Amino acid sequence: SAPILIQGAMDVEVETLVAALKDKQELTVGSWTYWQGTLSGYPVVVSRTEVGLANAAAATTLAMERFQPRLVINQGTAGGHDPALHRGDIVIGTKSFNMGAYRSDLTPAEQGVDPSKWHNFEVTMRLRDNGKLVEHSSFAGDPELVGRALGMADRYRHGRVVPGIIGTADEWNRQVARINWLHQTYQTAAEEMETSSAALVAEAYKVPFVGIRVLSNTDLHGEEFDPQTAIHCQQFVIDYAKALINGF
Amino acid sequence: ASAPILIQGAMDVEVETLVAALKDKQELTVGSWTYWQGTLSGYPVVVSRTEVGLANAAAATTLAMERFQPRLVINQGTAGGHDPALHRGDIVIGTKSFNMGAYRSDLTPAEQGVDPSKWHNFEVTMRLRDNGKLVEHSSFAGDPELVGRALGMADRYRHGRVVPGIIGTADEWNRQVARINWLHQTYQTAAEEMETSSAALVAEAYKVPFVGIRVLSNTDLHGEEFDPQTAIHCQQFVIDYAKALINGF
Numbered sequence: 093s094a095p096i097l098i099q100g101a102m103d104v105e106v107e108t109l110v111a112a113l114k115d116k117q118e119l120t121v122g123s124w125t126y127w128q129g130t131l132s133g134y135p136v137v138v139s140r141t142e143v144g145l146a147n148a149a150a151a152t153t154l155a156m157e158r159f160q161p162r163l164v165i166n167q168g169t170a171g172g173h174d175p176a177l178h179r180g181d182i183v184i185g186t187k188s189f190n191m192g193a194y195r196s197d198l199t200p201a202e203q204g205v206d207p208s209k210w211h212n213f214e215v216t217m218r219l220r221d222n223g224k225l226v227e228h229s230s231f232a233g234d235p236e237l238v239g240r241a242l243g244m245a246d247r248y249r250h251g252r253v254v255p256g257i258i259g260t261a262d263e264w265n266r267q268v269a270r271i272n273w274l275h276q277t278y279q280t281a282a283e284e285m286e287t288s289s290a291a292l293v294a295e296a297y298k299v300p301f302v303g304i305r306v307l308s309n310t311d312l313h314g315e316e317f318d319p320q321t322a323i324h325c326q327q328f329v330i331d332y333a334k335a336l337i338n339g340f
Numbered sequence: 341a342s343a344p345i346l347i348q349g350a351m352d353v354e355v356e357t358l359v360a361a362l363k364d365k366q367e368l369t370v371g372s373w374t375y376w377q378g379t380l381s382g383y384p385v386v387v388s389r390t391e392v393g394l395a396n397a398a399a400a401t402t403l404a405m406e407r408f409q410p411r412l413v414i415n416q417g418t419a420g421g422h423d424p425a426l427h428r429g430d431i432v433i434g435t436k437s438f439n440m441g442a443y444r445s446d447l448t449p450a451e452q453g454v455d456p457s458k459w460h461n462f463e464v465t466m467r468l469r470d471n472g473k474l475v476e477h478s479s480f481a482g483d484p485e486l487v488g489r490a491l492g493m494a495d496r497y498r499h500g501r502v503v504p505g506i507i508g509t510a511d512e513w514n515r516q517v518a519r520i521n522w523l524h525q526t527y528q529t530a531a532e533e534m535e536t537s538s539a540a541l542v543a544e545a546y547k548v549p550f551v552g553i554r555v556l557s558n559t560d561l562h563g564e565e566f567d568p569q570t571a572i573h574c575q576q577f578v579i580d581y582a583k584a585l586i587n588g589f
């Protein structure tokens with residue numbers, strides 16, 4: 093009877109999920125609200141995480157302690173990094189990673205600032221397991237959960253559903269050259285602000301995880317933020333969760 | 341039962357001195373996060389090894405809130421200097437901490453390249469809700485009485501100055517001196533590290549008094565490389581500080 097945990101950061105990313113729940117009970121602890129109910133008769137907890145890595149990790153940890161979920165779906169909006177993708181396309185996270193983690197080598201003031209020399213700082217994703225250090229350069233989406241979403245692609249009617257790499261950072265990048273550099277360096281499909289942080293906590297608790305993100309925008313094609321994409325993503329995720337539940 | 345003081349450090353070298361000071365210990369690990377529960381001066385204290393970076397700090401802090409319901413949080417450890425006035429061994433008491441790594445930029449076309457001086461602090465990363473209502477934060481103030489106590493104890497620290505300052509938290513280790521200088525000039529940072537504002541965010545959400553206490557382990561402004569002994573010195577000061585709080589309980 094362990095629930096599916098479904099996450100979104102902002103109100104617009106969870107209200108459709110919350111409306112789908114039957115026999116809802118609301119719980120707020122600290123800054124974080126949860127709605128506990130059922131989908132297709134099976135326990136589901138919807139979590140509004142608030143925004144960014146710290147909020148995502150807090151909200152995920154709190155859900156682990158309170159609800160002991162059997163799997164986590166983290167979803168919401170993202171900005172395009174891959175020029176092949178457009179607003180409305182959905183990325184299923186084959187992996188996510190902390191794209192905002194940076195270490196740089198020593199340079200004197202005279203040499204100025206060059207972000208192209210910065211390195212991904214992997215210690216930010218390092219964990220312990222039974223007390224022993226375990227390195228991580230990314231967090232893989234549970235590959236069966238990833239495959240299921242890809243297999244359901246034709247059920248989403250507002251864009252393509254594709255596998256891709258989710259770059260998580262406390263960032264909203266609109267310098268197109270920076271987006272291009274991040275894509276060329278890390279092969280990112282899209283950027284957002286929670287996935288790898290929630291994924292880190294799910295790895296620590298050994299709970300299967302998948303990130304599902306709709307492109308709400310992409311500056312690679314002059315496509316500005318469309319809030320309706322967040323609703324469409326939740327509709328797909330409800331369908332996805334119901335399919336999982338049909339198999340439980 | 342008395343609510344414990346929670347004391348945090350990210351790495352082994354930042355907690356082993358704290359752990360050795362506790363009496364009647366037990367050690368609890370959940371997920372990736374270890375806690376040592378014991379007493380200092382007969383009062384309950386929990387020492388937390390948070391692991392490194394903002395996500396880990398927030399998870400470790402949240403888990404401690406749920407398991408232990410602490411009465412206050414001291415987040416401590418090492419940091420890299422941003423203020424040229426400061427040297428390795430100096431301790432910064434966090435008048436405020438903030439998410440220095442949070443970046444938002446206005447639209448620029450590819451031909452204009454990349455310009456980090458145009459990346460502005462992205463405050464939504466510190467926004468919270470209080471009883472369901474959105475509350476903006478551009479930083480988290482250290483509890484001002486906790487901050488004041490640490491400053492009042494400055495001359496009990498045997499290995500450097502104790503100064504108030506702004507702690508810049510990011511998933512970063514900056515060694516481009518021009519970048520350090522820019523961050524200092526833009527945000528008035530004393531030092532940079534990787535946990536404080538994230539732990540502070542969680543403490544604010546739970547309305548638990550918080551203070552960040554950081555020793556400079558290094559600063560590229562003075563060619564001072566990392567010295568692990570600073571972490572031990574910081575823990576010694578924090579033990580003295582915690583015992584003073586306990587004397588008042």
Ligand SMILES: Nc1ncnc2[nH]cnc12
Binds near residue numbers: 171263264265283285
């Ligand atoms: N471009 C973008 N960057 C970061 N977070 C986002 N959420 C939606 N679009 C985003």
Ligand SMILES: Nc1ncnc2[nH]cnc12
Binds near residue numbers: 418514533558
């Ligand atoms: N310069 C530095 N930057 C980030 N974290 C640190 N921890 C110790 N020194 C540091």
